Design a protein around this nucleic acid. Structure first.
Ligand SMILES: [Mg+2]
Ligand SMILES: [Zn+2]
Ligand SMILES: [Zn+2]
Ligand SMILES: [Zn+2]
Lengths: 97, 178, 171, 107, 270, 554, 88, 112
RNA sequence: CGCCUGGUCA
RNA sequence: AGACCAGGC
């Protein structure tokens, strides 16, 4: 079935934080990618076996993370990149406020 | 899950300037003379010269075996065996590194008294010298200001040869026996 | 050269262990994962000091599973050699391409051609060795090397050093 | 303050912001015939000392930009002669609770 | 649109209505920090009624044979008559109830006295009644010092904001203001003893409740009022099945758009 | 989720840095040249040529390989490749700015056209807001068409001060198709019109000042004007434009996989004309083609008509179309999705269910599941539901042990066997009193969605209590409704504690209750009331019995 | 900044009573954990449902949790289930 | 005085149906429209242009168009917007998620 | 509006 | 997987 826009807005109203997330992630997309702690990209070449991770270009192997996002968004991002735009994924805030 | 370090360097993309590591007293950014304490304060780098290290380890490795029993209710070749024990009791045992750091540390050490190592430090800290030298001087036997200023090229112009030679003398004087 | 650096690690604890002696379990896992580790940014982590006052702070509970995550701030004794650093250790292995000295938790190797010429290599020796006019280096022989370059690797650090300068050789 | 009748020449007005600190304001007759502030709908405003303002912020933990704004040309804003950065406190009645205290910074 | 335009607005832990930037949109949710679900149309008695009647109800004059509380009401009735020190609190009470009158006649010019307000008092008393089987016969046992001094004391505890300072604490008095009028409106001495013959017990309970019942009506820092507000309007806009102006639905579309050329421009001048 | 453990630490995205790709970076990242335009067939031989899709990049055929990166299809995101263009091309969307920027700087030297010197300029240089500066700065110097080398400073209009030099007249500019042209005025007369080669534009921007970038809403690290023009082109991996195999000896490539095929072709042809018989201005009759395809690939719904239809008259989804509002990625994939653990049927009223309940048909109750963790508090109950199988009602249909492996109860040669292990999870059936979220679209209330107590029943309908009718705004004339089943012990919580129907009784959208009594119950409650109406013992006793909370005091 | 972002147990200003969202989430979180096989701090009076047990731990305020309340500017205030008044 | 009118008028639209809405809602909206400075419309033209994050305004009417000038001006999104998280698959700071929960190891001992 | 079932198109 | 048409409240 479909948990569309309107349905979301209600859950948001109810302030049903977690459940809303659950509907979106665990109950649908939910994908696990790797990022470069340097350039906010999916570049990373995680071999999740011999624990190698690398990221030639920004050249890494040490500063790497793992995040859960909707495969719809992995796609949204790659799609934006293919249009030469860079959606950086950073795991820590720096601009304060 | 590795282990970060007290300092959020805003790595804004361009990660290209990884300087070299030489006795130009240029150690990784991770070891500037100016690092930060947990409390948030600044603090001089911390350089341990052999033996002085052997004590810092042994001392914590000991006060560990102790707090490991508070909750348990609910001479050269001689110290080799004595420490092996302190290991198979408060170590991971599979830390083949510490075994080796303790034999090495306990073999090439240059002092046996927390008194001696204390005087050694009192003395050397009056030079205003950098901690990495202040360490190298304590763990490396030196007879000439040349043997010194040569194996520790970061010195060279930071102290007259006579000066550094006096200090060197006092070192062989304090240098515990066997 | 040996250092005492202030570090901090993050551990994710399963609700299972959310008992009474948790602080206890945390610390223990800290050690299992840190003591004996190895980076290029910290080199060899060897011993966690002040076991007693290790700071756990308050850990927070993740939000899908109950696992909580604490940022365990500690302090310990580290050691990462450098290029141009002078250290002396015992020789362990020794072949036709050189001998390999061991300084602490690390092994520094010296090329047959990074020594002096008047020092050749003797094959039919037991144990294998390197002879000279008045010097003879083999197994237990205590050397003093100058670390020329360092190559960080896996959970270890190797480096090549020379003994072709002055005040560098045996003792 | 200067009160023009039908208007001022575009050659005249470009001479006001030429003698700081002192400032000048232009007002039209037909515009001041009635006092807007006296309108059923217009609640009363109030200026705030660069202290009272530096307090309003500190008390609400607000950065200047998160504050409700009022037009530099806003009818009332002129009436009191605000200045880019000045803050006004608007106090009006309320069908939920007697009165409501609200602030307006000027852009 | 309404929704997408308010998603991010929620009441923060300081009791402020802000969005994702942190910009204040309302300093106190709804100009009263009350959660809509805890509100009923109460009536502010103090507003209506002739100037005459008013006095006949809230006026107590311990210094008069015909304007004093007949001891058939108060236990300490007769031994109160003439006491000047009381008559000051008593007059203080009255001067207040009158300031209220004028104030309300300023906010609500219509004369309309029925408004949405937290803590239904008319009922909070009705229970007080039969919960202590209070008999309209025998006299009370409240000191006049009891009533007026606990009533003023109650207000001190109807907390919306907590702030440890002047700016904040002053907003408090604002957020409450209206409520209190209603509060004093129903806890006026005369009223308290003649209209609803409470006792010491009765009163203390009625008080105890109002306080807690109030504290419940406050809005929970967490409320996603942006979407709430949006939906609450948009919804009844779908239920719209349809003197000569611009009507509703097309009119609202007009409004939200902030359109220059509206079908009906009109303008009423008095 | 995403399966298989990783020594990688995991955090949550706290910020999003939007930038532009530096042709260099594009190269750094890429894991494949992409020289050929074809798909595979190593000369009919199936596989993939080191040309397009998988010159090392992602894969197909269910074969680990992904540059050793193994994993295969599910786990391995895509691995961007690149493609060195023949000549710089614009960026279908940036054209707006690329142009609006040139009108802001002067060619030849490349620098602002209004310095601190011009006063009306200072004001535009204080407005801390890239969107607004650049929108002011541009309205200022979009008019002045002469690169002034000397201007009247903060003193006498008599004394002329100097700065940058080369007054080279500035040409007004206009947009025609995907190319920018401008006319230069000469006095003495008549204009001078020429096409502004990308190769040139690109350059002037390259030279534009570091502090000039910034003054004009830009960014030294992330988005430098010189990047709005494509030198190198990122090639999205298979997963973005997956194939589709009708078994074997059949293709199935995606729309995009073709436009690259196009762009690539159109590129090679160019290059081959520039290291060969290059009829100078007969090349720019094909360089525009690359400008075309590489514009189309990203946007295909432009103003200069040419829709670039795919042989068949079919439009061709531009990447942009894939995201465009509603039904598209952002609005129809991320802001809303399809979900598992959800059912729908026809609703009917049942005057015998407490308000908060919801009659669920056994059919569904046996379909919908709930991951319960084997705990000493239910180890028993659970082993029973497991023995009960996926067919009898109170039962379950899947057991999962810590070793991330699914046991399919309905087939497994061990269904009857199996002793659960604490910590394992048993996906069991929805049972009586499993808090669920119910709802009737269109959803415009908090209330169009509420939490009910599952009450499994026969027959195929969602039997809901009556009074909870108007909050959903439903009738029974063939009305359908949706049921969503929570999943984590905390999820339920959020439903039972804030979404329960009892909680929604008083609606804040009008500070008054939102559910009442309708039809029969209402109509009847009036009649029953009336003074005129009296009831005798034999029945009065029955009526008593029915109120479940009768204290037994006739 | 940190610790500069944490308001002292004194000077505390948020609400004394637990928000509905908090309690809702504490019960959920605690439930999830109890179901996770975590230690239960109350006598299970026979109870066997986590959220049932959670409701109990929460009624004898024996829930080892702390609610960190963020303010619009980043600073926060820490409260414990133990403290917080549970009216609702 | 304008907010006053804007409100007054909006109320008249809902009142003309014989319906009832609690001040607050219409007020909040009337306010959202006013604060900023003048009369900010609830349209792709007004409100959806404010400083709000990109990804947020991204989910409404100008999607790609907005995303483009978003990397062209190297914007930064706080991830404070509800939408933001919804798109990332994270728990948005909303009711249940407007705070954090921690195991106070201290009290976790006094309990036994 | 949104949601669902068609199938139909080949 | 999509574009059209039929239907449903
Ligand atoms: Mg119907
Ligand atoms: Zn990288
Ligand atoms: Zn791969
Ligand atoms: Zn020029």
């Amino acid at each position: 079935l479909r948990f569309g826009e309107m349905e979301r807005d209600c859950m948001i109203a109810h302030g049903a934080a977690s459940f809303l997330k659950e509907r979106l992630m665990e109950a649908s997309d939910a994908f696990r990618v790797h990022i470069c702690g340097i350039c906010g990209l999916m570049t990373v070449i995680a071999k999740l076996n011999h624990n190698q991770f690398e990221c030639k270009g920004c050249d890494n192997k040490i500063d790497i993370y793992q995040i859960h996002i909707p495969y719809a968004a992995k796609l949204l991002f790659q799609e934006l990149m293919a249009m030469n735009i860079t959606p950086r994924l950073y795991t820590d805030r720096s601009r304060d406020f | 899950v590795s282990t970060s370090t007290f300092q959020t360097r805003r790595r804004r993309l361009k990660k290209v300037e990884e300087e070299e590591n030489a006795a130009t007293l240029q150690l990784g950014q991770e070891f500037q003379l100016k690092q930060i304490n947990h409390q948030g304060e600044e603090e001089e780098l911390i350089a341990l010269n052999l033996s002085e290290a052997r004590l810092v380890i042994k001392e914590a490795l000991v006060e560990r075996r102790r707090a490991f029993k508070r909750s348990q209710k609910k001479t050269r070749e001689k110290e080799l065996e004595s420490i092996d024990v302190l290991l198979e009791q408060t170590t991971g045992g599979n830390n083949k590194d510490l075994k080796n750091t303790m034999q090495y540390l306990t073999n090439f050490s240059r002092f046996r008294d927390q008194e001696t190592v204390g005087a050694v430090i009192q003395l050397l800290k009056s030079t205003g010298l950098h901690p990495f030298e202040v360490a190298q001087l304590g763990s490396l036997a030196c007879d000439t200001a040349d043997e010194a200023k040569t194996l520790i090229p970061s010195l060279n112009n930071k102290i007259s040869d006579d000066e550094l030679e006096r200090i060197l003398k006092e070192l062989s004087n304090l240098e515990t026996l066997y | 050269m040996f250092f005492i650096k202030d570090l901090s690690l993050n551990i994710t604890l399963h609700p299972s262990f959310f008992g009474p002696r948790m602080k206890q379990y945390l610390k223990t896992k800290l050690l299992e994962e840190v003591e004996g580790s190895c980076t290029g940014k910290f080199g060899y982590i060897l011993c966690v000091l002040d076991y007693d006052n290790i700071d756990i702070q308050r850990g927070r509970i993740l939000p899908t599973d109950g696992s909580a995550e604490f940022n365990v701030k500690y302090r310990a004794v580290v050691f990462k050699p450098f290029k141009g650093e002078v250290v002396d250790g015992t020789v362990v292995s020794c072949s036709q391409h050189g001998f390999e000295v061991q300084v602490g938790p690390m092994k520094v190797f010296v090329t047959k051609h990074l020594m002096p010429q008047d020092l050749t290599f003797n094959a039919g020796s037991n144990p294998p060795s390197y002879q000279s006019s008045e010097d003879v280096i083999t197994i237990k022989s205590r050397i003093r090397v100058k670390i020329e370059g360092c190559i960080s690797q896996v959970s270890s650090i190797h480096a090549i050093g020379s003994i072709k300068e002055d005040y560098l050789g045996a003792i | 303050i200067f009160v023009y009748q039908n208007n001022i020449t575009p050659s005249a007005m470009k001479l006001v912001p030429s003698i700081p600190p002192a400032t000048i304001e232009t007002f039209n007759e037909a515009a001041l015939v009635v006092n807007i502030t006296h309108h059923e709908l217009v609640p009363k405003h109030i200026r705030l000392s660069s202290d009272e303002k530096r307090e309003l912020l500190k008390r609400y933990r607000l950065k200047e930009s998160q504050l409700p704004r009022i037009q530099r040309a806003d009818p009332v804003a002129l009436y009191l002669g605000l200045k880019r950065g000045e803050v006004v406190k608007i106090i009006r009645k309320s069908e939920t609770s007697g009165r409501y205290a609200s602030y307006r910074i000027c852009m | 649109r309404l929704v997408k335009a308010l998603e991010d607005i929620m009441v923060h832990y300081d009791n402020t209505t802000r969005n994702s930037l942190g910009n204040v949109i309302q300093f106190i949710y709804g100009e009263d920090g009350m959660d809509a679900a805890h509100i009923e149309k109460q009536s502010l008695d103090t507003i209506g009624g002739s100037d005459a009647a008013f006095e006949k109800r809230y006026r107590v004059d311990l210094l008069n044979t015909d304007h004093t509380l007949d001891p058939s009401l108060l236990e300490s009735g007769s031994e109160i008559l003439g006491d000047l020190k009381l008559q000051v609190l008593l007059d203080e009470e009255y001067k207040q109830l009158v300031k209220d009158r004028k104030f309300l006649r300023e906010v609500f010019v219509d004369g309309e006295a029925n408004w949405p307000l937290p803590v239904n008092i008319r009922r909070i008393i009705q229970n007080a009644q039969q919960t202590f089987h209070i008999d309209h016969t025998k006299p009370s046992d409240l000191t006049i010092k009891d009533i007026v001094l606990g009533v003023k004391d109650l207000q001190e505890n109807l907390l919306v904001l907590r702030g440890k300072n002047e700016i904040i604490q002053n907003a408090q008095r604002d957020a409450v203001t209206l409520f209190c009028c209603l509060l004093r409106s129903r806890l006026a001495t005369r009223r308290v003893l003649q209209e609803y013959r409470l006792t010491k017990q009765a009163f203390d309970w009625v008080l105890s409740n109002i306080e807690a019942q109030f504290l419940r009506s406050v809005v929970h820092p967490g409320e996603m009022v942006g979407v709430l507000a949006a939906q609450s309007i948009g919804e009844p806009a779908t239920q719209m099945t349809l003197k000569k102006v611009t009507s509703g639905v097309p009119r609202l579309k007009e409004i939200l758009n902030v359109a220059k050329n509206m079908k009906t421009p009109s303008l009423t001048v008095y | 989720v995403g399966q298989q453990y990783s020594s990688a630490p995991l955090r949550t995205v706290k910020e999003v840095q939007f930038g532009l790709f530096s042709p260099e970076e594009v190269r750094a990242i890429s894991v494949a040249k992409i020289r050929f335009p074809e798909t595979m067939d190593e000369t009919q031989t199936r596989a993939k040529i080191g040309g397009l899709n998988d010159p090392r990049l992602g894969s197909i055929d269910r074969n680990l390989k992904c540059q050793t990166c193994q994993e295969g299809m599910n786990e391995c995101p895509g691995h961007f490749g690149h493609i060195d263009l023949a000549k710089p091309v614009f960026h279908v969307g940036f054209i707006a700015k690329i142009k609006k920027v040139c009108e802001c700087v002067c060619m030849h030297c490349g620098k602002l056209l209004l310095d601190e010197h011009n006063e009306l300029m200072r004001q535009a240089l204080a407005i801390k807001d890239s969107k607004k500066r650049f929108a002011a700065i541009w309205t200022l110097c979009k008019t002045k068409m002469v690169c002034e080398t000397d201007v009247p400073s903060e003193d006498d209009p008599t004394q002329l001060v100097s700065r940058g030099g080369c007054g080279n007249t500035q040409p007004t500019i206009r947009k025609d198709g995907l190319k920018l042209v401008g006319s230069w005025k000469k006095d003495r007369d008549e204009p001078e019109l020429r096409v502004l080669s990308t190769e040139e534009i690109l350059n002037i921007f390259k030279h534009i000042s570091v502090k000039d970038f910034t003054s004009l809403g830009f960014n030294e690290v992330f988005s430098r004007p010189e990047w709005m023009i494509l030198t190198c082109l990122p090639v999205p991996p298979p997963p973005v434009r997956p194939s589709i195999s009708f078994n074997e000896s059949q293709r199935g490539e995606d729309d995009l996989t073709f436009k690259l095929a196009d762009i690539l072709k159109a590129n090679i042809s160019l290059e081959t004309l520039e290291h060969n018989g290059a009829p100078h201005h007969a090349i720019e009759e094909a360089e525009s083609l690359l400008q075309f395809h590489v514009a189309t690939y990203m946007d295909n719904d432009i103003a200069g008509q040419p829709q670039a239809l795919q042989k068949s008259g079919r439009p061709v989804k531009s990447i942009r179309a894939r995201l465009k509002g509603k039904e598209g990625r952002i609005r129809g994939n991320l802001m809303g999705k399809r979900v598992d653990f959800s059912a729908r049927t026809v609703i009917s009223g049942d005057p015998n269910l407490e308000l908060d309940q919801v009659g669920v048909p056994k059919s569904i109750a046996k379909t919908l599941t709930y991951p319960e963790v084997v705990t000493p508090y239910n180890i028993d109950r659970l082993t029973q539901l497991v023995r009960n199988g996926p067919n009898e009602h109170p039962g379950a249909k899947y057991v999962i042990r810590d070793s991330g492996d699914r046991i399919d109860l309905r087939y497994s040669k061990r269904a009857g066997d199996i002793q659960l292990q604490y910590g394992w999870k048993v996906e069991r059936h929805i049972m009586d009193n499993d808090p669920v979220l119910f709802n009737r679209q269109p959803s415009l209330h908090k209330m169009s969605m509420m939490a009910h107590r599952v009450k499994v029943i026969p027959y195929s309908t969602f039997r809901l209590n009556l009074s909870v009718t108007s909050p959903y705004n439903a009738d029974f004339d063939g009305d359908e409704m949706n049921l969503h089943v929570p999943q984590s012990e905390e999820t339920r919580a959020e439903l039972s504690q804030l979404c329960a129907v009892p909680l929604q009784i008083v609606s804040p959208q009008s500070n008054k209750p939102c559910m009442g009594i309708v039809q029969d119950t209402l109509c009847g409650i009036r009649k029953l009331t009336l003074r005129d109406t009296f009831i005798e013992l034999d029945q009065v006793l029955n009526m008593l019995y029915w109120v479940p909370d009768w204290d037994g005091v006739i | 900044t940190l610790k500069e972002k944490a308001i002292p147990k004194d000077q505390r200003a948020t609400t004394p009573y637990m928000t509905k969202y908090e309690r809702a989430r504490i019960l959920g979180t605690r439930a999830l954990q109890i179901s996770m096989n975590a230690p239960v701090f109350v006598d299970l009076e026979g109870e066997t449902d986590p959220l049932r047990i959670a409701m109990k731990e929460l009624a004898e305020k024996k829930i080892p949790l702390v609610i960190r309340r963020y303010l619009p500017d980043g600073s926060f205030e820490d409260w414990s289930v133990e403290e917080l008044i549970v009216d609702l | 005085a304008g907010r006053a009118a804007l409100y007054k008028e909006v109320y008249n639209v809902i009142a003309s149906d014989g319906s009832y809405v609690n001040y607050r809602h219409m007020a909040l909206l009337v306010d959202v429209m006013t604060t900023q400075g003048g009369l900010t419309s609830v349209t792709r033209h007004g409100f959806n242009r404010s400083n709000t994050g990109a990804l947020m305004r991204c989910s409404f009417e100008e999607t790609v168009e907005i995303l483009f000038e978003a990397g062209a001006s190297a914007e930064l999104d706080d991830c404070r917007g509800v939408s933001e998280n919804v798109i990332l698959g994270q728990m948005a700071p909303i009711g249940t998620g407007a705070f954090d929960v921690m195991i106070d190891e201290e009290s976790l001992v006094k309990y036994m």
